[PDB]
Write a protein that binds this ligand. Structure first.
Ligand SMILES: [Mg+2]
Ligand SMILES: [Mg+2]
Lengths: 797, 865
């Protein structure tokens, strides 16, 4: 009921205390596990089983060990009548029984005992005679005042149970040279090499190996001096790996050439090791590909996709702040306070860590040139984070304990000042901000990562598309495994040059239809060109381009300076009147999305023309183009229907003008709650849906993605929210709308395709949800594609 | 009888149940004749005849004309006139008619012989003009000659219309008759019988024509044989002494007095009174001149009301002492006349109360809820501009250009019309004191419109053709200058801006309105609560029939004085918890006081108070950032740097989705503690004064159960402290707004922890559509014009989308908490079409602003009966 025994060949419990379950199963596979008991009078009944199995209860020294699902007293049960095996060994164990019994159970500090040993000593403990231990025994006895086995255990069990319990027979590693204790991993936890990786200490007690007082030996010397025990250890290691089907971290004790197994748990491993060990164990036939896909956590894969620091622990004393892990990866460079200086420094070969209070669309140039980005404000889904995550570039955002003073070209963290040019390192996986130039780990030249991902690719049901707005980004996406473009944000296709920025600002500020017509035609080349490069890069793959959904305030550059730059790039009155007419109290719910293409169909005409102008031109250059055109911010069937009418109108003109007719698809964003509520009406008129879970989450919760920081931390602290809904998909709420739209849209159009291009498309827990809803694909930024690929597979296998 | 059915005074071969055999019109003529009306005699050729005409090779079936002749003998006999006889001419109209919707030829039977007789009875010019028009219409509708070709003869003659003699028209007639030969090659038929025959054939031919079949095949009119032909005697009121035309309402359309109300002209045609060539007279002059005809008119009017059970608007003609009923439709009426007539017809036993509730339109009722102008038509010559009807009602006062001067003038007894380009929250004081508000910029949802509509105060907004110059104390409409102090009148129902001091209608001795509303109250299922934030407004609400307060917006409870605004700004600008505590203590008295006044006004009724949901930017001073920081330091005492830093920390990109609602009370529970304390301190204080207090505390902008749970914990904590301190324990309820889509998606979880739901369809609609309620105007007009939206979703509830969430939350919450009460306090609560929807969903009540309560009351009743 309460006590669970285990011994040679027998085992009441199984692997399904944390140790009690492992000791039981490890004992049932026939290994030399010292017999013992596992508490959940009964300890007496079990003590009879452990007694008979050991032929002692003929002294029987015991040990008590604590063990939870998620300290140890050794050599208990020894008195003067208890003390066959050797005097030095006995008195040594006795002296250790007094120290460990008094520190763990009684409560006397170990310092008071080390004082007596230091006073007695000689230069080494191994030089002490048996008589010296006798004197040390008496000295330890005097420390108590300054005996019954049954009571020793009672007080030992009560003490261990203060903060389940395990009592086991004693195997002695302190009998002499042919005895000891050791630890190992069955394979290298850093590199994954299939070679025993551990230590061993002759003539010492359990934790003396790792205690550090003495220096352990290498396993290679155990093979030389103790071949019988090492021969059985090798066999036992391959035994444990063969049973659990995984690399192991074990504890073992040798008692006069008699190998005893004590503890064994699954080995914690690095990203490199997780993959190499997974790949090898597959080649070895040990595990199938299903299990292998489970053995590499998304955090493992994430480590192998970006640069890493050699040893995070080795710089803990240099961390000056901790922010949000906006985009994973390590970065090292010199402090910089402006995007302009980043591009300049990068052009010269200097690595720049861009540090700012906040990034604007103007800084996209310098953000791409910086090795890493550090921002004081903004969340994980902020603009800087998405762009950084898409580039696989290190970013630490929301560093609240930093104040930037761009005028004085310095930033402070409390009372410390870090000046421009000082070397700074960022850890985008942990958010740590470290002073100085820290070590990077070397990239893996492993073909293993490629092989492993091919298993996940062949295993996943979901396709993984990419969110890329430029030809170069689209190429990177395909290199990372993207099966197409799920979202090309057309509004984000004018950041490159002053030429492009001037064109957009001409369109935004346009007042007369003559002014707008000039701008839309001036934009046509940029769209057709940029759209052209993507089609060929994704040759043979679907490309979903979305109509403009601009943040009007974002395209704007003192009020006079703003108006000044616009006139350079119309009359002062036209600009002042237009700035007044464009300002919105809540632009996130204002004049954007398809509301823009509907009010001004000439704008949608240019884009659609530029798309087919590029599609036909590239098809004529041998490219297989599979284009899709998607409408943003739809809430009614009329909105989509209205825009589709324009698309097909341009389709007729384009195909006839160029003498080539292409098949194309037309679809809609599902990022408005209403769109999902009447999705059966939209499904009839749409070829595909793509959930925009950024806006949808915002509309469902009423959370302004910009201003949510005012209270998200309080909501998280008080259990109101279990996650940032902008990071982890809300299954109860947002997910209900997703299921609704998916089921409704497919019931109306069985050939409907359904995807997700919101930021949750790249979040593992959300990917598993999308797979459950039965979505056809997910779409995420380029450097998140491999994560979604593995996530899309782990939920399947 | 078989194919030809005669009708007219004393004759009715058909009946009302023959809409498909006769025409729709042919069936009405048959019914009007049976109920005893003075119908000019005529005959209806059935649709069977048309079908036989189509199946007989586009020729009149045998034996049909002899029936048409027998029916002609009736009309001739009844009228003592004959086709073609100039001594006693008979002229016919020919109207087509099917069973439902799908041209007329007048004065058929007219030729050179007949016209001479018509000239002897009606006048030479009139006879030859009618002959002219007949040639045109008959030549076009029956012969196929376009009117465009006839206008050539007239233009050519006029070269060598109302300024043309009769001798000229007799010649112009000759030109028209030549158009027959010069176009169709054949001659104008002079025999009346031949004209009719041709007219009948042309009607049956018009049935199977293209465009005509396109209308049926496109729309898909199931099961239609053909058109009937309605041939009716013409009748003239310009035939001398004993003739005339008139119009009337069977009751006064302005007052509802049961008394014929109309005009009458002796020896004139219907269009003669419209053109205004002569001035009509009172029906009394008819009772004197033609006592018999008038006596017959009184009997016809009594038949009309008896048959139609309503007041009627008619056209009648007296031809030679014989009264003829030509037209009649339900008479339009004012609100005052709508109610009185409805009440009188109930007392009269002519209709029951169920019908009466359907007769008074919500728009009728609204006229009686605000001041009115005595006679709108009488000031058309003074209208200088028209804006948007932001808030209905009349207003009259002297022009003023600042909210400050409005309060001053009001305090002195002067009626002030506040004129501005735009109102800001600073102007609430003067806007409340102004008789009416006029703004040059802004839409129906603009600041002036929202605030004015809530007060039931007249407002005309968006008057784009006015420019206000408050410095020079003038505003202009083109070249006209309207100076400060000039008398101006506003019509917030029509948007009219009228110069001068116009007359107001006298107050009503309206016991009828009270009686009528008691019928609607006894009929409606929904309760109607009120949205009021002040004691007076809550008192106003109850006087207007409110059964309680469905929503008291606490954020709207500090516009009254500088003291209160200074207090709020101290809370907003608070940095340290010590600063905030000081501010909250300054607010506690104002909250407790107002809650006492509200509770006392609603003695015995439920009062739902909502926790703060403030627009932070709204409480900040207007003007340039420098002036704001200066004014805040004065009110707060903080340094210029502290204020600049705080304003920066308060700014939000999208405040409507930002740090507001319950997110504020959760982050700062001391705020919720102050409010809740003020509530129960007031509840007990009023309870000790004999007031029955039924308080409810509502949480705003809830999207999760934890948010509501968190705040309820605070409510119950303060309730215990207050009750213990004051030695009195009151029962209270705690509930939530359902104005976030997620709240409805997981409403089963929130229902377990809420006593009531109140749908906030303003935010809910906004979140559902993604429409910024402020900035939606950027594109709403285009969406409405292009059929994208059928309505402004902020005005009419979106049943497919927002309504789906309402049904969801209502059903989920009640399944989780059977004792849950469900209401609606969004602006749709006062919109008739939305009220009917809420009744269908099974909501328990609607809540709307005070002066909209009577509207929701009537609406809640009209959807039931
Ligand atoms: Mg979006
Ligand atoms: Mg609200």
């Amino acid at each position: 009921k309460r006590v669970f025994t285990f011994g040679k060949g027998r085992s009441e419990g199984n692997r399904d205390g944390g140790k009690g379950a492992n000791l039981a199963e490890m004992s049932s596979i026939g290994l030399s596990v010292p017999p013992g008991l596992t508490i959940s009078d009964e300890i007496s009944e079990g003590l009879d089983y452990v007694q008979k199995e050991m032929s002692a209860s003929k002294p029987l020294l015991l040990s008590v060990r604590s063990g939870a699902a998620i300290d140890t007293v050794l050599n208990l049960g020894l008195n003067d009548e208890v003390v066959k095996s050797g005097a030095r060994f006995a008195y040594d164990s006795y002296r250790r029984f007094l120290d460990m019994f008094g520190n763990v159970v009684m409560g006397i500090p170990h310092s008071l005992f080390d004082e007596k040993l230091e006073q007695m000593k000689i230069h080494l403990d191994t030089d002490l005679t048996a008589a010296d231990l006798k004197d040390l025994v008496e000295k330890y006895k005097n420390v108590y005042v300054e005996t019954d086995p049954k009571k020793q255990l009672e007080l030992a069990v009560n003490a261990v149970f203060d903060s389940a319990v395990n009592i086991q027979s004693m195997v002695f590693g302190n009998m002499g040279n042919t005895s000891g204790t050791g630890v190992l991993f069955t394979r290298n936890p850093s590199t994954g090499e299939k070679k025993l990786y551990g230590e061993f200490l002759i003539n010492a007690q359990g934790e003396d190996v790792v205690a550090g007082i003495r220096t352990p030996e290498d396993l290679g010397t155990m093979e030389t001096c103790m071949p019988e025990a090492y021969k059985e250890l090798v066999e036992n290691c391959e035994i444990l790996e063969r049973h659990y089907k995984d690399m192991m971290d074990i504890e073992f004790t040798v008692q006069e050439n008699r190998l005893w197994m004590l503890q064994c748990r699954t080995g914690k491993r690095t990203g490199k090791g997780a993959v190499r060990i997974a790949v090898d164990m597959v080649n070895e036939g040990l595990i199938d590909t299903r299990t292998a896909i489970k053995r590499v956590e998304t955090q493992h894969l994430d480590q192998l996709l970006h640069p890493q620091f050699e040893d995070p622990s080795a710089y803990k004393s240099h961390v000056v702040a901790t922010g949000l892990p906006a985009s994973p990866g390590a970065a090292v460079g010199q402090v910089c306070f402006s995007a302009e200086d980043a591009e300049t420094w990068h052009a010269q070969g200097k690595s720049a860590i861009l540090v700012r209070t906040e990034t604007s669309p103007e800084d996209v140039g310098g953000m791409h040139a910086a090795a890493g980005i550090l921002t004081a404000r903004g969340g994980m889904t902020s603009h800087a984070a998405v762009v950084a995550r898409g580039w696989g570039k290190c970013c630490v955002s929301g560093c609240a304990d930093i104040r930037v003073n761009d005028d004085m070209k310095i930033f402070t963290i409390g009372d410390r000042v870090i000046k421009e040019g000082d070397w700074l390192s960022l850890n985008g996986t942990t958010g740590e901000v470290i002073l100085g130039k820290q070590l990077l780990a070397p990239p893996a030249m492993s073909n293993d990562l490629e092989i492993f991902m091919s298993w996940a690719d062949q295993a996943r049901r979901l396709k993984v598309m990419a969110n890329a707005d430029t030809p170069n980004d689209a190429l990177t996406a395909r290199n990372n495994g993207a099966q197409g473009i799920g979202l090309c944000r057309t509004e984000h296709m004018f950041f490159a040059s002053d030429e492009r920025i001037k064109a957009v600002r001409k369109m935004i500020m346009a007042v007369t239809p003559e002014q707008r017509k000039v701008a839309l035609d001036l934009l046509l080349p940029y769209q057709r060109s940029d759209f052209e490069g993507i089609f060929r890069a994704m040759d043979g793959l679907p490309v979903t381009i979305r109509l403009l959904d601009p943040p009007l305030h974002e395209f704007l550059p003192d009020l006079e300076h703003i108006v000044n730059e616009l006139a350079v790039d119309m009359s002062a009155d036209e600009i002042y009147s237009k700035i007044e007419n464009l300002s919105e109290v809540n632009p996130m719910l204002g004049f954007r999305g398809c509301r823009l293409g509907i009010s001004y169909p000439e704008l949608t005409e240019m884009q659609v023309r530029a798309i087919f102008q590029a599609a036909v031109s590239m098809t004529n250059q041998g490219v297989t183009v599979i284009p899709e055109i998607m409408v943003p911010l739809v809430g009614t069937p009329q909105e989509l229907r209205h825009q589709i009418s324009v698309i097909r109108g341009v389709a007729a003109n384009v195909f006839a003008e160029m003498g080539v007719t292409l098949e194309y698809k037309v679809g809609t964003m599902i990022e408005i709650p209403r769109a999902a509520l009447i999705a059966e009406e939209i499904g009839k008129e749409a070829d595909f849906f793509s959930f925009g879970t950024n806006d949808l989450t915002q509309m469902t919760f009423g959370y302004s993605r910009d201003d949510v920081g005012k209270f998200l931390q309080i909501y998280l602290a008080q259990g109101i929210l279990q996650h940032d809904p902008f990071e982890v998909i809300d299954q109860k709420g947002v997910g209900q709308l997703i299921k609704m739209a998916t089921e409704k849209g497919r019931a109306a159009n069985p050939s409907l395709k359904v995807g997700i291009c919101g930021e949750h498309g790249g979040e593992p827990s959300s990917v598993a949800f999308f797979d459950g809803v039965g979505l056809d694909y997910v779409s995420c930024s380029p450097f998140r594609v491999p994560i979604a690929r593995l996530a899309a597979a782990q939920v399947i296998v």
